[PDB]
Design a protein around this ligand. Structure first.
Ligand code: CLA
Ligand code: CLA
Ligand code: CLA
Ligand code: CLA
Ligand code: CLA
Ligand code: CLA
Ligand code: CLA
Ligand SMILES: CCCCCCCCCCCCCCCC(=O)OC[C@H](COP(=O)(O)OC[C@@H](O)CO)OC(=O)CCCCCCCCCCCCCCC
Ligand SMILES: CC1=C(/C=C/C(C)=C/C=C/C(C)=C/C=C/C=C(C)/C=C/C=C(C)/C=C/C2=C(C)CCCC2(C)C)C(C)(C)CCC1
Ligand SMILES: CC1=C(/C=C/C(C)=C/C=C/C(C)=C/C=C/C=C(C)/C=C/C=C(C)/C=C/C2=C(C)CCCC2(C)C)C(C)(C)CCC1
Ligand SMILES: CC1=C(/C=C/C(C)=C\C=C\C(C)=C\C=C\C=C(C)/C=C/C=C(C)/C=C/C2=C(C)CCCC2(C)C)C(C)(C)CCC1
Ligand code: SF4
Ligand code: SF4
Lengths: 142, 146, 81, 73, 742, 61, 73, 73
């Protein structure tokens, strides 16, 4: 897979006063997220957790608590200003993980190379009754 | 995050840093007994004056013994919380970074054994504060209203 | 693995779920079982939050993607604290 | 009065639990093929008629018992 | 600058559309494939902002809708005046209003309801009323059925005229944007034009018609030979006989020696023992001074000339250190989004309705009003209800604005930005205050009740036990009772009589007002009110502040204003839309209003209302057990709720029997609401499915495919039925009780 | 100075499990003793009603 | 209170309360062990039904005993 | 006594209706024909396709307990 990650660097942050939507104990103990994109021009955009702020020129760096907010902001940036982006996960050990594209091409369209994790080749009605599988680990949809 | 004058100011940070719950330059047991005697002197007042025997000449001892009992219950609760959350050889979870960024030694107050010393100190101090409030409220008791 | 996603061969490869997946779970892969020659896939069920909006879109006979519930975790619960 | 009310409410609760655990039996342990065409599997085939007729009895009794009451009132 | 620009004939008055429902919504106009179509049709009729994208057309539409509303109001007024003219005993009531029950509605003798036309005195039979029109019609010196008749006619004329104006302004001459969006001249006029000149012309109608005829009636005369109004202005000599100063034309006014008119324009204050009402001289001075004040206020803003301010030139100057740039640009927000204006105006209107409700009882303006008990009570509680509803609507539409038309890119602001930037702190602290008030205002009642049922009365919360004193209220009352001494020499007595100083006003063996003392029970009830209000504010403010996006759902706004949930994911996401926040807050507002009105009823019937003996001993309607039985919930049951519910429950076989019947249906619906509030949908969907099968079996399956109501509509119908049940119950209770005993 | 007194006069009160044991057994014993030795002057329960009560309706039963 | 107000409201409220307790001095030292989360939906329904039943039994039982104890006839 | 007996029969028939609908329609109706694979008590099956609040058979027992209490009262 010639789809390498980008190893999220430490680049400046958007101009924002700092507010009660930031991180909490969770981010400092378990995990948090960082979304990163390059911007075309200093404009205004509403952060997910409150108010609005301005971005800068070049690459950006925003931190957030949960992946859902990051991806919501990313879809907003892709449907409002037509720019690409990534977001990374961080662990308190110091690890950094690359999550969303996994190839660079959106998961919206086809790109061979992805495996087939979690298919069942039978219509929904073919599932069986729990009695046939009771007292076991298996379930009907498996 | 937001930093208003309340959460960020010289005098407020000074005050909060001076009270025993954050002055890491003292043994945890001593901070515990200090907060204990503080709350002991604290709670005797309303418990005694407004208790269910206030119209009786025993109301003093009554309120004081009730305060002592509440202190004992809360010390039990402290020890229970400590044994629940703090393991016996694992590290601390106290803030080890100050405002400037001086990497602070892990607060022994935030350890199992340290929490135990704290609990014992708090209990002894609460008892002492309650009995002191009693002796100052019912022997040398002119300049007050009660 | 907290929740669970299943996909069935009545998938018409219309690709509404992925466009509506809030937390980047599903995707498409090359198949031979429809015109669009593409079927769903769920290799990212960890971040599966559990909202049915995905299968609230699949315009098939009854359904083609099911979201079976299971145990809970820290990320499957939208926790942020 | 106390004994009567006691026993009646207990009977009601047990009666509800009965149908509850019956539905549980259907959900968890009923097998289709081990019961092909038997009276049990014969019930399910026309649940619509049963539900409809129960709803009809309910509607009749409700409408008329409420009508008479409001008229007298 | 500003001109009269309009446009000509956009839409033609053609019935082409009336036969095609849902012409406005593209989807609705296609056809009802199922039954939810006919719910969705009504559900979004008035939703103008979801029918276009430009403010011009929706502004025209709301301009026409306002005319529709005004036409309905005029028709209602006309119906009222008619029923007063042709179907009342109003003349007999004017003969002597001390012990003659106002009745203005008779019922047809068909189905045994003749008993409804009960005995009301004065040789009349009819359903007794409590609207309180009669005090007004006696204030304005109507005193003749011809006047009611012609007024009803004129009201009908104005109604048809307004309906016309509506049709014409929408269809033929539609206003343009630069007209609507021009708020400067609108403020200028409405300040100077509408309110000021209104109060001025009313002062006219009072000093030239009402005042003399009212003074004559107080002297005591059959209104038959009372001189007609116009015969009091044409021939001056009558008013001359009344008021010497009034026979001096216009010299004492223009020549600045206004003190001559002191007789009919004065500043007495207090009430008038002849009728307990207000000294009409005072109310005339009031209306006139208010007219002058509004006129001088109206001249603020520059409209076309070179003088005057600009509503853009006022905000941007204010910019403090903490907030920063201040109100810059807010002028654009409140000029480019109708919902914002609707919310602001609804909030202010609800507050004004509440304060009107309050100021009414404590200062009875009309004559012979503070002695028709039921009228006073019913007016107060009605105004309270209207205010509550208006406030909730304000919050809802504020949330709608927050969702749809808010955007920082062009409708920017630096104040609201800060507000939203720390919403969590606001909601957290308000929540904690709500918990604190709940505890220390209800647990007190619980403690008092318990320590009562345990045979420890001397450990209760009352005057006879551990004591809580509302010292600030008594302080203010003392100040208001000693203020006419030095601070306000131009007055004669206290501003009202409810202040803790003076005597009592009683007419026809009944009392109207007297001093009002405050006991610990008043402290407790006031804190209950404060707590419930704080909780309602918490609900609604949380809804508004979190309508955009919460820390649970990141992009709530994109999902729209009104949607049921976001699926059972992430542990369940039921009731997250601001719409559901309003659905919740409605119940709490209902509870606040209910407890407030109960407190009012008990306090009045236990400390003010009642009868006065020949010697002067007062025996109140309920015996004055408030300060000793309002401090136990069990008391509320026993002393007030159970006891004073007698007259409604024995009401069968009497004139008041109607008030009895509702007392059950009110409860019934009240029940019924639960069926919708508790259940869900899928169950009903499956039941409807089986019923559709049962029908289809007989070739009766209708093409309008049956569908159990959608979730949001289920919650809506539930809350509507619940509010209806509660309000109808308290309504029947109040009317039956007060009109029977009082 | 005060640190040594505070340490020594509360020295056995440092072990935590021992602390739970001591506090619980002491609280139980203390409340049991004070309630068994409750004086009637401050408790309206430690003495009887001491008055002839009221008979219920329908005679006495 | 449990049959009407469904979860998401209380979930957001718990979020706010959690942030509050987290950023408060003298209490941030005390941590929690189970992240506070509003009850589940079926759990809601259950506890609401339990409350309904308990109240609807206590009320009528006390009334039934008292009405015939005050009179014994 | 006649009117009260009729009201009691109403309560009986409608409570029976609730419970039997919960029993027979537990395997699955056209709203969710494969319900038999979701176990007994589940929150719901999503807000789409018409909304599916209170569709488990546990929820049927839930909605029946109310009428049981009512009839016994
Ligand atoms: C609203 C909060 C509140 C406050 C401030 C007080 C205040 C007080 N209570 Mg109390 N109490 C409350 C709620 C409250 N109570 C409730 C809700 C209950 C019922 C669970 C009780 C049951 C209660 C008892 C049983 C007793 C008190 C007693 C007391 C007094 C000590 C003090 C005046 C005691 C007392 O009367 O001493 C004077 C006492 O014996 N309270
Ligand atoms: C209902 C509330 C309440 C009540 C009735 C009392 C009652 C009392 N307090 Mg008190 N107190 C309270 C709350 C209360 N406290 C709180 C919240 C604090 C803050 C920690 C204090 C801090 C305090 C101090 C510092 C002192 C008292 C003291 C007293 C006593 C004498 C008061 C006097 O004459 O001056 C009296 C028994 C005085 C005393 O000698 O106590 C015995 C004293 O020195 N109180
Ligand atoms: C109070 C109350 C009332 C009156 C009802 C009535 C009913 N419920 Mg119900 N329910 C309630 C509370 C109530 N519920 C509560 C609190 C719950 C717990 C959530 C439930 C849970 C529940 C379930 C789970 C089920 C019912 C069912 C039923 C129906 C049973 C059939 C019957 O007797 O028809 C009686 C019919 C009526 C009382 C309606 C007549 C009302 C008037 C007369 C209509 C005409 C009025 C007016 C003249 C017309 C104009 C009105 C307007 C235009 C102004 C009936 C409609 C069952 C059902 O669907 O049966 C088929 C069913 O499955 N209910
Ligand atoms: C105060 C009452 C009031 C007023 C003034 C209006 C005003 C209006 N409604 Mg309306 N409406 C109301 C109550 C009201 N509504 C209620 C209670 C309902 C039931 C939910 C509806 C349902 C409704 C629908 C379904 C539609 C309107 C429409 C309209 C608009 C054109 C109607 C028209 O010209 O008829 C003129 C009628 C006459 C001159 C006389 C007829 C008799 C207008 C803004 C229409 C609209 O806005 O479509 C874009 C439309 O299609 N209304
Ligand atoms: C708010 C408007 C309103 C309402 C609710 C009613 C309501 C009623 N009218 Mg009515 N009416 C109204 C306006 C209204 N009217 C107007 C504006 C006129 C003048 C054209 C009339 C003229 C009128 C007559 C002449 C009669 C009624 C009658 C009635 C009753 C049948 C019913 C109570 C009838 C009635 O009550 O007879 C005793 C009857 O005969 N009305
Ligand atoms: C704060 C301003 C204010 C206040 C306190 C009152 C107070 C009162 N008004 Mg008034 N009113 C006002 C403004 C006000 N009004 C304006 C701006 C207009 C136009 C009117 C027109 C108006 C009318 C037509 C009437 C009153 C009446 C009354 C009495 C009932 C009182 C009524 C009255 O005169 O009582 C006898 C009455 O009929 N008002
Ligand atoms: C003069 C004030 C005013 C005005 C202009 C409006 C106008 C509007 N409101 Mg609104 N509202 C008001 C007061 C007002 N309301 C108040 C006081 C409340 C609090 C109770 C609300 C609560 C409210 C909610 C919760 C919602 C609206 C909505 C709407 C919009 C669609 C109307 C609709 O669907 O009803 C059509 C007409 C009916 C449904 C008739 C109902 C008749 C009642 C229920 C029967 C009982 C009456 C006795 C419309 C722009 C809705 C909206 O914007 O949808 C997107 C919406 O969701 N409003
Ligand atoms: C008294 O407020 C007065 C204070 C003065 O603020 P500014 O002078 O910066 O605000 C100018 C005003 O015109 C508002 O724009 O208001 C604030 O600082 C906002 C925060 C209020 C904090 C209230 C805490 C409760
Ligand atoms: C007349 C008379 C008589 C007779 C009587 C009789 C005979 C009666 C009967 C009665 C009856 C006869 C009754 C019945 C009842 C029934 C019931 C009550 C049922 C129930 C059911 C259920 C509960 C079910 C369940 C389930 C399900 C849900 C599903 C499946 C599974 C199961 C089974 C679990 C004599 C001569 C003796 C004497 C005189 C009088
Ligand atoms: C709130 C409300 C109400 C009430 C209302 C009212 C009461 C109103 C009033 C209003 C008013 C009170 C109005 C007024 C107006 C006035 C005006 C509009 C005037 C005008 C005038 C003019 C125009 C004149 C001119 C002139 C002449 C001719 C002579 C002199 C000179 C001059 C040139 C100036 C009711 C409850 C019923 C219903 C609901 C709502
Ligand atoms: C005859 C008939 C029947 C039956 C019926 C019934 C049974 C009914 C019932 C009913 C019930 C069981 C109840 C009801 C109730 C009602 C109500 C409840 C109404 C109300 C209305 C209104 C309109 C009100 C109003 C108001 C108030 C009072 C408050 C607020 C203000 C206002 C003015 C809004 C049958 C089916 C046989 C057949 C068909 C016909
Ligand atoms: S389920 Fe519907 S959406 Fe998801 S893949 Fe199959 S077809 Fe496309
Ligand atoms: S079931 Fe009804 S309520 Fe529960 S989540 Fe799905 S939609 Fe919201």
């Amino acid at each position: 897979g010639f789809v390498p990650p980008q190893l999220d660097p430490s680049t400046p942050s958007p101009i924002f006063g700092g507010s009660t939507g930031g991180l909490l104990r969770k981010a400092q103990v378990e995990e948090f997220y960082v979304i990163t994109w390059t911007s075309p021009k200093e404009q205004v955009f509403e952060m997910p957790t409150g108010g609005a702020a301005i971005m800068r020129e070049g690459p950006n760096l925003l931190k957030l608590a949960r992946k859902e907010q990051c991806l919501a902001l990313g879809n907003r940036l892709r449907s409002k200003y037509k720019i690409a982006y990534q977001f990374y996960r961080v662990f308190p050990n110091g690890e950094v993980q690359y999550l969303h594209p996994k190839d660079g091409v959106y998961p919206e369209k086809v790109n061979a190379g992805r495996q087939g994790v979690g298919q069942n080749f039978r219509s929904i009605g073919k599932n069986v009754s729990p009695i046939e599988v009771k007292f076991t680990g298996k379930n009907s949809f498996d | 995050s937001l930093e208003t004058p309340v959460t960020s100011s010289p005098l407020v940070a000074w005050y909060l840093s001076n009270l025993p719950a954050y002055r890491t330059a003292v043994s945890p047991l001593l901070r515990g007994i200090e907060v204990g005697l503080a709350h002991g002197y604290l709670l005797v007042g309303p418990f005694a004056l407004t208790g269910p025997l206030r119209n009786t000449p025993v109301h003093g001892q009554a309120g004081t013994l009730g305060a002592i009992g509440l202190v004992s219950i809360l010390s039990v609760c402290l020890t229970m919380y400590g044994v629940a959350s703090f393991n016996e050889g694992e590290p601390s979870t106290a803030p080890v970074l100050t405002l400037t960024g001086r990497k602070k030694e892990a607060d022994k107050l935030q350890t199992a054994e340290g929490w135990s010393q704290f609990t014992g100190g708090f209990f002894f101090g609460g008892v002492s504060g309650a009995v002191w409030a009693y002796f100052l409220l019912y022997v040398l008791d002119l300049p007050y209203f009660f | 693995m907290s929740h669970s996603v299943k996909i069935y061969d009545t998938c018409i490869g219309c690709t509404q779920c992925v466009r509506a997946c809030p937390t980047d779970v599903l995707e498409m892969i090359p198949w031979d079982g429809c015109k669009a020659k593409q079927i769903a896939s769920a290799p990212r069920t960890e971040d599966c939050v559990g909202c049915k909006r995905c299968e609230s879109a699949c315009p098939t006979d009854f359904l083609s993607v099911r979201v079976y519930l299971g145990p809970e975790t820290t990320r499957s619960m939208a926790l942020s604290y | 009065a106390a004994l009567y009310t006691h026993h009646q409410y207990i009977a009601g609760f047990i009666m509800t639990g009965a149908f509850a655990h019956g539905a549980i039996f259907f959900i968890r342990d009923y097998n289709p093929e081990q019961n092909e065409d038997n009276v049990l599997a014969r019930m399910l085939d026309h649940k619509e008629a049963i539900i409809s007729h129960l709803s009809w009895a309910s509607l009749f009794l409700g409408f008329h018992t409420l009508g008479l009451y409001v008229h007298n009132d | 600058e500003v001109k009269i620009v309009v446009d000509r004939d956009p839409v033609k008055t053609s019935f082409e559309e009336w036969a095609r429902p849902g012409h406005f919504s593209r989807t609705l106009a296609k056809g009802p494939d199922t039954t939810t179509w006919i719910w969705n049709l009504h559900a979004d009729a008035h939703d103008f902002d979801s029918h276009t994208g430009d403010l011009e057309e929706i502004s025209r539409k709301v301009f026409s809708a306002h005319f529709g509303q005004l036409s309905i109001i005029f028709l209602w007024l006309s119906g009222m005046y008619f029923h007063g003219a042709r179907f009342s005993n109003y003349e007999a009531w004017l003969s002597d209003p001390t012990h003659i029950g106002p009745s203005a509605q008779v019922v047809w003798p068909i189905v045994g309801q003749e008993i409804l036309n009960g005995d009301v005195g004065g040789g009349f039979r009819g359903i007794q009323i409590t609207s309180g029109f009669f005090q007004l019609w006696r204030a304005s010196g109507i005193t003749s059925e011809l006047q009611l008749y012609c007024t009803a006619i004129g009201a009908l004329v104005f109604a048809a005229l307004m309906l016309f104006a509506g049709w014409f302004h929408y269809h033929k001459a539609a206003p343009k944007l630069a007209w609507f969006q021009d708020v400067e001249s609108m403020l200028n006029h409405h300040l100077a034009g509408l309110l000021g000149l209104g109060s001025l012309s009313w002062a006219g109608h009072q000093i030239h018609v009402s005042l003399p005829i009212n003074q004559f009636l107080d002297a005591g005369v059959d209104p038959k030979e009372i001189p007609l109004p116009h015969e009091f202005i044409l021939n001056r000599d009558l008013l001359a006989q009344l008021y010497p100063s009034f026979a001096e034309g216009a010299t004492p006014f223009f020549t600045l020696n206004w003190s001559k008119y002191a007789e009919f324009l004065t500043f007495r204050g207090g009430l008038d023992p002849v009728t307990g009402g207000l000294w009409l001289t005072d109310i005339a001075h009031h209306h006139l001074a208010i007219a002058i004040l509004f006129l001088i206020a109206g001249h603020m803003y520059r409209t076309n000339w070179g003088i005057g301010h600009g509503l853009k030139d006022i905000l941007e100057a204010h910019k403090g250190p903490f907030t920063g740039q201040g109100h810059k640009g807010l002028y654009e927000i409140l000029t480019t989004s109708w919902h914002a204006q609707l919310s602001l105006n609804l909030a202010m209107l609800g507050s004004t309705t509440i304060v009107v409700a309050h100021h009414m009882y404590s200062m009875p303006p009309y004559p012979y009003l503070a002695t028709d008990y039921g009228t006073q009570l019913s007016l107060f509680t009605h105004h309270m209800w209207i205010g509550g509803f208006l406030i909730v609507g304000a919050a809802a539409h504020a949330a709608i604005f927050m969702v749809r038309d808010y955007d920082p890119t062009t409708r920017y602001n630096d104040l609201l930005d800060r507000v939203l930037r720390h919403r969590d702190a606001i909601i957290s602290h308000l929540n904690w205050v709500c918990i604190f008030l709940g505890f220390h205002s209800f647990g007190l009642y619980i403690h008092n009740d318990t320590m009562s049922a345990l045979g420890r009365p001397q450990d209760m919360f009352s005057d006879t036990a551990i004591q809580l004193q509302p010292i600030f209220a008594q302080w203010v009352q003392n100040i208001h009772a000693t203020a006419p001494g030095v601070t306000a020499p131009g007055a004669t007595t206290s501003t009202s009589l409810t202040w803790g100083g003076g005597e009592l006003v009683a007419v026809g063996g009944k009392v109207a007002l007297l001093p009002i003392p405050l006991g610990t029970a008043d402290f407790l009830v006031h804190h209950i009110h404060a707590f419930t209000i704080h909780v309602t504010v918490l609900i609604l403010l949380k809804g508004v502040l979190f309508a955009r996006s919460s820390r649970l759902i990141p992009d709530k706004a994109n999902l729209g204003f009104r949607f049921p949930c976001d699926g059972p994911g992430r542990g369940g996401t039921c009731q997250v839309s601001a719409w559901d926040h309003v659905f919740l807050g409605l119940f709490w507002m209902y509870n606040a209003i209910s407890v407030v009105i109960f407190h009012f009823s008990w306090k009045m019937q236990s400390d003010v209302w009642g009868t006065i003996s020949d010697q002067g001993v007062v025996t109140h309607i309920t015996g004055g057990n408030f300060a000793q039985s309002s401090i136990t919930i069990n008391g509320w049951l026993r002393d007030f709720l159970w006891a004073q519910a007698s007259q409604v429950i024995q009401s069968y076989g009497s004139s008041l029997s109607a008030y009895g019947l509702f007392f059950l249906g009110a409860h019934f619906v009240w029940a019924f609401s639960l069926m919708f509030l508790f259940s869900g949908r899928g169950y009903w969907q499956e039941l409807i499915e089986s019923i559709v099968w049962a029908h289809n079996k007989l070739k009766v399956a209708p093409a309008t495919q049956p569908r159990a109501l959608s979730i949001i509509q289920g919650r809506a119908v539930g809350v509507t039925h619940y509010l209806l049940g509660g309000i109808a119950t308290t309504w029947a209770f109040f009317l039956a009780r007060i009109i029977a005993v009082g | 100075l005060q640190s040594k007194f505070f340490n020594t006069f509360a020295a056995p009160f440092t072990k935590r499990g021992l602390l739970l044991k001591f506090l619980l057994i002491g609280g139980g014993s203390l409340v049991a003793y004070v309630s068994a030795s409750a004086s009637p002057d401050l408790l309206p329960i430690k003495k009887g009603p001491q008055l002839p009560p009221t008979p219920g309706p329908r005679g006495k039963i | 209170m449990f049959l009407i107000s469904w979860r998401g409201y209380w979930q957001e409220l718990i979020e706010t309360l959690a942030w509050a307790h987290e950023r408060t001095p003298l209490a941030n030292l005390i941590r929690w062990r189970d992240k506070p989360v509003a009850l589940s939906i079926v759990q809601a329904r259950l506890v609401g039904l339990a409350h309904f039943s308990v109240g609807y039994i206590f009320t009528y039982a006390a009334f039934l005993i008292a009405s015939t104890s005050g009179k014994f006839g | 006594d006649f009117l009260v007996h009729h009201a009691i029969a109403l309560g009986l028939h409608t409570t029976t209706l609730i419970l039997v609908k919960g029993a027979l329609d537990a395997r699955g109706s056209k709203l969710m024909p494969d319900k038999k694979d979701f176990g007994y008590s589940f929150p719901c099956d999503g807000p789409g396709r018409g909304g599916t609040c209170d569709i488990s058979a546990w929820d049927a027992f839930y909605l029946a307990v109310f009428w049981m209490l009512n009839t016994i009262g």
